[PDB]
Each structure stands twice: as structure tokens, then as C-alpha cells.
Amino acid sequence: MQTAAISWGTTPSIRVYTANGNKITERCYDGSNWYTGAFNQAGDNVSATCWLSGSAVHIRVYATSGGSTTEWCWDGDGWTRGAYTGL
Amino acid sequence: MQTAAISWGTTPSIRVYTANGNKITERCYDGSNWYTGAFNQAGDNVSATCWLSGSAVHIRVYATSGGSTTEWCWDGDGWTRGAYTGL
Amino acid sequence: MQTAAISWGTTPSIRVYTANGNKITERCYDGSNWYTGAFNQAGDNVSATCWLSGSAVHIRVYATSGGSTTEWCWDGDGWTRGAYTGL
Numbered sequence: 435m436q437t438a439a440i441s442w443g444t445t446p447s448i449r450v451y452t453a454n455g456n457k458i459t460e461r462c463y464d465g466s467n468w469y470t471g472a473f474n475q476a477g478d479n480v481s482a483t484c485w486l487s488g489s490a491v492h493i494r495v496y497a498t499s500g501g502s503t504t505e506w507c508w509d510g511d512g513w514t515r516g517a518y519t520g521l
Numbered sequence: 522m523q524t525a526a527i528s529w530g531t532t533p534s535i536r537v538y539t540a541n542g543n544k545i546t547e548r549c550y551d552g553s554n555w556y557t558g559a560f561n562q563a564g565d566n567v568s569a570t571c572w573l574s575g576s577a578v579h580i581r582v583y584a585t586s587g588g589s590t591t592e593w594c595w596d597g598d599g600w601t602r603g604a605y606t607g608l
Numbered sequence: 609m610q611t612a613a614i615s616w617g618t619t620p621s622i623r624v625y626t627a628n629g630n631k632i633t634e635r636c637y638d639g640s641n642w643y644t645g646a647f648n649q650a651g652d653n654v655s656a657t658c659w660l661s662g663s664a665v666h667i668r669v670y671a672t673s674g675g676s677t678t679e680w681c682w683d684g685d686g687w688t689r690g691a692y693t694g695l
């Protein structure tokens with residue numbers, strides 16, 4: 435089982451991505467309880483990065499299954515596929 | 522052997538967590554020598570994130586042993602168990 | 609195959625490091641196309657962190673081959689070795 439972690443803001447918000455048995459899922463903290471997020475994509479390995487534009491968070495999740503990495507994007511309104519390609 | 526890296530400030534401070542044979546340990550840089558930090562917990566996989574409240578650092582380490590992730594918290598005065606749970 | 613991701617600035621810039629078959633490479637984004645960066649070092653495991661000095665980026669990549677981690681540094685003038693040692 436393999437994790438990636440990100441955080442942002444003053445609360446802060448935390449997102450932990452877990453790769454287990456070719457599935458990546460998301461646990462979320464926003465200052466109250468941990469909860470399961472919307473992110474569900476295939477992968478045996480994950481890494482993640484985020485930034486703020488004002489108060490709006492932007493997340494990029496790099497999901498790898500075998501020899502292929504797909505980027506998944508949060509920009510305020512659902513997970514969308516990004517334009518990232520490997521070597 | 523697997524690592525996680527975080528940094529903060531402009532010095533910078535860096536922490537590198539290393540999972541080796543089910544033990545996670547911490548190496549630290551604050552502007553002079555690398556040194557062994559107080560973090561010592563079980564795990565074969567590690568991720569970490571951090572934030573600053575003014576000058577005070579807050580670190581969260583996600584230590585995974587098998588199919589269980591535990592969150593470890595630095596808030597200025599020792600490593601404490603965090604409230605994180607998985608799915 | 610294993611990745612590490614970092615980002616900085618408002619654009620933002622992103623760097624994704626991929627460990628594949630004991631080789632770590634780098635895919636870069638700066639606001640248009642994804643492109644291949646200069647990073648090329650050995651490892652089966654990678655972590656990375658970055659910070660700004662003003663708006664100029666400093667990157668540290670932790671490349672692990674078997675039992676030992678080597679730090680690689682970007683400070684604006686090519687990839688250089690760092691002084692990191694383990695336990």
C-alpha cells in the first residue's frame with residue numbers, strides 16, 4: 435500500500451492518496467473529521483502536488499499503472515484527465 | 522528502501538523520511554549539518570506534508586504498515602498520534 | 609514505476625520525477641507543453657521537494673538505489689550532488 439500527501443491553507447486542508455490493489459482513493463481533512471473524497475482512479479503508485487490561486491485549490495494527482503502515468507486534475511469542479519505524458 | 526521529502530521556510534529546513542525494513546526514520550537539515558531527528562515509527566511506506574503558522578512548523582507523516590496507515594504529527598513539541606483513518 | 613511531484617509559482621511550474629528500471633527522469637510543465645527535463649540519475653525510488661528564494665526555484669531530489677539515498681540539487685545552474693547522508 436503506498437500513499438502521497440498534500441496540504442494547503444491555514445486550517446489546513448490535507449489530502450492523502452492511497453494506492454492499494456491497483457486502486458487509488460482519497461482521504462480528506464478540512465478541519466473537522468477525515469472523510470473519503472471523490473477521487474477514484476486506477477494505479478499501483480500515486481504522487482500529488484497542489485497550489486492555491488487565491489482561495490481556490492488546484493490539485494494534480496499522478497496515477498501510475500504499470501509503465502503508464504495519467505495526470506488527474508482538481509480545479510474546483512470535479513476530477514478531470516490532464517495533458518501530462520511520460521518520456 | 523523508500524523516502525518522502527518535505528521542506529519549509531527560506532533557509533530551508535528539509536526533512537527526509539526513510540522507510541527501510543519496516544522502520545521509518547528521519548534525517549534533518551536546518552542550514553548546517555544533516556542530523557538524525559526524533560521521528561521513529563513502524564512502516565514500509567511513508568509520505569509527509571507540512572505547513573507554517575507564522576514561524577511554527579507543523580508536520581504530518583503517513584506511515585503505512587501492510588494495509589494500515591497511521592498519521593504522526595509534529596506541532597512543535599514531540600511526535601503525537603494523529604486522528605487519520607483509511608477507507 | 610514510482611513518481612514524485614512538485615510545483616511552485618502561480619502558473620504553476622510542475623516537475624514529475626519517474627523511477628523506472630533503476631532510472632529517474634523528469635517531465636516538466638511551465639505553462640504550455642510538457643517537456644523532458646535535464647534530470648537523469650539512478651534509482652528505483654524518488655522523492656522531491658522545492659522552495660523559492662524570491663521567485664527562483666530550489667529543488668532537491670532524493671534518489672534511492674537499493675540501500676542508499678543520494679541527494680541531487682537544482683539551484684539555477686544544473687543538477688549538482690548534495691551532502692545528504694542517511695542514518
Ligand SMILES: C[C@@H]1O[C@H]2Oc3ccc(CC(=O)NCCCO)cc3S[C@H]2[C@H](O)[C@@H]1O
Pocket residue numbers: 623634636644645646647665682684685686687
Ligand atoms: C527547474 C529546472 O527546470 C528546467 O529548466 C532547465 C534549465 C536549464 C537546462 C539546461 C541546463 O542543464 N543548463 C543549466 C545549467 C548548466 O550549467 C535544462 C532545464 S530542464 C529543467 C531542469 O531539469 C529543472 O527542472
Ligand SMILES: C[C@@H]1O[C@H]2Oc3ccc(CC(=O)NCCCO)cc3S[C@H]2[C@H](O)[C@@H]1O
Pocket residue numbers: 532533550554555668679681689690691692
Ligand atoms: C539545502 C542544502 O543545499 C545544499 O547546501 C549545501 C551547503 C553546504 C555544503 C558544503 C558544506 O559546507 N558542508 C556539507 C558537507 C556535510 O558532510 C553542501 C551543501 S549540498 C546541499 C545540502 O545537502 C542541502 O540540500
